[PDB]
Structure 1
Amino acid sequence: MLEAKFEEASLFKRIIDGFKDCVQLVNFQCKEDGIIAQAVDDSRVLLVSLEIGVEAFQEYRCDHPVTLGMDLTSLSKILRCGNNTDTLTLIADNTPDSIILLFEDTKKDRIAEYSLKLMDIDADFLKIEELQYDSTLSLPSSEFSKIVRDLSQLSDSINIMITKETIKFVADGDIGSGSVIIKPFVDMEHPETSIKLEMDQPVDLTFGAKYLLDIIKGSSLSDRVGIRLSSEAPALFQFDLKSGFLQFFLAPKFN
């Protein structure tokens, strides 16, 4: 019997809103160490891997591993039924079916019981990627989202170039072109504003704009995002959470 009790009910909503547009169906794997989830886009261009450990949950009890197949377009509505000052409780019986979400207020007495019918996704999701990348950078999530949404208007393809202490976003379209160049700097007065870069080999490769806009929708979770690139390897966009993280393995375009 799965029973999870969150610290804040809006944290799960912020997690799910990251997957709202780029993912339709997910398979939550519930174990003793936390909740894992992996999903692939309908076009199979990006992969989402979420892990939330037991630290984020105020309470946790998972007797046996559980597989919860669910649709995000309904869970988003269900979480939108809560409040800003509520707490969330996930309930699942011994046999995985009709996950129950409980919203409880801490200021007053209120019980909001919602149900979601599970669905059987035959495809399994347990693959793990562990490979060294050519470049690993870290920049504030708000700034990266600003650049992505600013350059998405020029064209549908955004090229990322990592060179010696230089970070370049290029967007060439029909109405013109644009280029944003940044340098890795250390900000002692605030650590969440600084930009870090460790490069082993220069990188230059292009992504689609709409998938980048979908990934940057996860900036509401963490104030800083890590971006890991390698040659002939998927790009790792990681938002680090308090108990775990959320990573997008997004695939570049063919040259």
Structure 2
Amino acid sequence: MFEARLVQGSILKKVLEALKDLINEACWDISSSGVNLQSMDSSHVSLVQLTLRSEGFDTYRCDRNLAMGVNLTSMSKILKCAGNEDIITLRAEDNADTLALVFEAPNQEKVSDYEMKLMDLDVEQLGIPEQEYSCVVKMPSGEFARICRDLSHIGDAVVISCAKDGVKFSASGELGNGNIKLSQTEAVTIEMNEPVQLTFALRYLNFFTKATPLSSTVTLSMSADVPLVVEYKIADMGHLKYYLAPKI
């Protein structure tokens, strides 16, 4: 039996909205330490990693480790049936043939109870070696979303050049070209060991920014030749990290 109660149920609503466009199906690894999800998109160009720590929940119990296979579109649909101030409880029996989801409000007048079928997935897990990066940019999440949206109307790739004093985003296509310069100051801060210059597919960045409602800040971590990390903190709980392989 697994059971986790989250009073700030809107966190789960936003997590699923931030996932369902990038990936269809994923395995939720539950253990006594928390919830972990790790999945590559079908094209193997990006990977998303979700961490929700045990201690972030209001009640949390894992009698035994589980790997639930979930259609994220279906779970997304169910979570749209929760109000933004609902208390959300997740709950899975020994068999784990279904995931139960309970939506409540402190006044308790509407209680909703959903049962969704799980599925069998090759749970293929993978690891990320904790590194430091040449450049780490912390900036408002809304600003980064706007940059990625605007530049995607210029071209389909963005060159991210990071220096000690600022970060630039550049794109070009048939219309012409464009460059957006951000200065270190809604703070923009840059921790740089060395300069970097990387190119990334804008279509994937615009999937990542569906996580923007989870945090007013976003962090970009870059080094030569390695995937970009785009991380949104889920306050008092964990994070949503997106990995994007550079071009060439």
1:250 aligns with 2:244: yes
Residue 72 (structure 1) aligns with = 72
Runs of 4+ in 1 over 3 A off after TM superposition: none
Corresponding residue to 2:223 among 221, 224, 230: 230
What are the equivalent positions in structure 2 for 1:157-176 lying under 5 Å apart? 157-176=157-176
Shift of 1:126: 4.2
How far apart are residue 84 of structure 1 and its match? 2.1
Contact conserved, 1:102 with 1:111, CA < 8 A, in 2?
yes
Counting aligned pairs with the same residue, the percent is: 36
Q: 2:12 matched to 1:12?
A: yes
RMSD: 1.1
Map 1:159-198 onto structure 2 (within 5 A): 159-185=159-185, 193-198=186-191
Pairwise CA distance, 1:183: 1.4
Q: In structure 1, how many angstroms separate the alpha carbons of the residues matched to 2:125 and 2:51?
A: 13
For the 8 Å contact 1:161–1:168, the answer to whether it is kept is: yes
TM, length-normalised to structure 1? 0.94
Greater Cα offset, 124-133 or 4-13: 124-133
For residues 164 and 126 of structure 1, the distance between their equivalents in structure 2, rounded to whole angstroms, comes to 33
Q: TM-score, normalised by structure 2?
A: 0.96
In 2, Cα distance between equivalents of 1:69 and 1:146: 34
What is the aligned residue count?
247
- 1:116 CA displacement: 1.1
Unaligned runs of 5+ in 2: none
Structure 1 spans left out of the alignment, 5+ residues: 186-192
SS of residue matched to 1:13: helix
Q: Is the 8 A contact 2:46 2:242 kept in 1?
A: yes
Map of 2:206 onto structure 1: 213
State the Cα distance separating 1:130 from its structure 2 match. 1.1
CA distance in 2, matches of 1:131, 1:41: 23
Paired AA for residue 83 in structure 2:
N
